[PDB]
Design a protein around this ligand. Structure first.
Ligand SMILES: [Cl-]
Length: 354
């Protein structure tokens, strides 16, 4: 039996709802701050991860080529995950007749945000390839290097990125109500083509010494630009927007209303954007010590969330004075962005008070 874990906000569960929302938002705030600081300030008490990656002076990154292979591998990985898991798992469940399991498997369905989520994941690949955030092809980017060496290959990669993004957007809104559509099919097909053009055509071409684009002289500026213009700024934005999200959740808890829910939902979407646009670089700090699953697990233990919301302990909890830390280091499957999403949204719209 599929368990949707239906619950609505009521006067009787409101205190637990406030406290648990706060807890999950506090954890998200802490995690995003630590992720940004690991890159920007200090990784494990030493130089920042940005400095480590740009220097690439020892294992596991002893060359700019090694860095770039990791960059391209992690672009390929998110293309694979979007096509075959985020879109593909619900699709294959649905086609097998497990249609209700399919509907409840869709990542970001609570907010009807799956299309935009997965599209942002593809824009993460764009950003990595272009060395920018704002859709500009930077002078110091993989795209510029490949364009100079093999313009055909560059054009095919750029086209493949665009075709995956547009194929996901073409899925009728919301994806959860159109899982078997031809467009789900076209979006899967486009993601598969993109996944292939990155991990096969691109990595091989760079790795081939005879193409003369894998030296540190060629690739160092690409690595430096990627870290300084793409990765660190994205994590800075994530930290700032998870901070904003925390404040929005506190105001909702302190003065609950339909408008306050809407405001917290706005903050959730806002914070999700840099997160989703970071998913082509799920390596280093975010891929250590369970950070990614602490921030973004899917699926959730939805029945456990309902039990929390109905619990007297979370209803009765009091917080330490002026303390923004979480009360409880919650399990992966009852924390993160999607747990807050569950707490803020129902069936594609902000939740309402009774
Ligand atoms: Cl959806």
């Amino acid at each position: 039996t599929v368990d949707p874990a239906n619950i609505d906000y009521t006067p009787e569960n409101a205190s637990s709802w406030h406290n648990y929302m706060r807890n999950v938002a506090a954890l998200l705030k802490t995690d995003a701050t630590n992720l940004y600081n690991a890159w920007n300030s200090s990784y494990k008490g030493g130089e920042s991860y940005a400095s480590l990656f740009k220097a690439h002076s020892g294992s596991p990154y002893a060359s700019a080529l090694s860095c770039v292979e990791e960059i391209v591998d992690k672009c390929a990985e998110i293309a694979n995950e979007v096509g075959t898991a985020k879109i593909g798992d619900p699709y294959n469940l649905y086609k097998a007749g497990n249609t209700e399991e399919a509907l409840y498997a869709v990542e970001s369905w609570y907010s009807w945000h799956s299309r935009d989520d997965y599209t942002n994941n593809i824009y993460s690949i764009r950003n990595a390839y272009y060395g920018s955030l704002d859709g500009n092809i930077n002078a110091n980017s993989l795209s510029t290097v490949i364009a100079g060496a093999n313009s055909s290959l560059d054009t095919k990669i750029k086209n493949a990125i665009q075709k995956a993004a547009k194929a996901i957007q073409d899925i009728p809104q919301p994806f959860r109500n159109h899982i078997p559509s031809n467009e789900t099919v076209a979006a899967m097909d486009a993601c598969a083509e993109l996944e292939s053009i990155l991990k096969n055509d691109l990595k091989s071409y760079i790795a081939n010494n005879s193409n003369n684009i894998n030296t540190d002289a060629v690739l160092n500026p690409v690595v430096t630009q990627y870290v300084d213009a793409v990765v660190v700024p994205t994590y800075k934005s994530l930290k700032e927007k998870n901070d904003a999200l925390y404040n929005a959740v506190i105001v909702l808890a302190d003065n609950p209303s339909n408008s306050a829910f809407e405001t917290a939902c706005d903050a959730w979407i806002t914070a999700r954007e840099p997160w989703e646009k970071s998913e082509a670089f799920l390596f280093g700090p975010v891929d250590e010590m369970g950070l990614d699953p602490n921030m973004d697990s899917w699926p959730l233990d939805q029945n456990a969330i309902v039990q929390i919301l109905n619990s007297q302990s979370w209803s009765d909890l009091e917080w330490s004075e002026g303390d923004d830390e979480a009360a409880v280091e919650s399990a992966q499957n009852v924390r993160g962005f999607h747990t807050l999403e569950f707490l803020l949204y129902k069936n594609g719209e902000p939740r309402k008070v009774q």
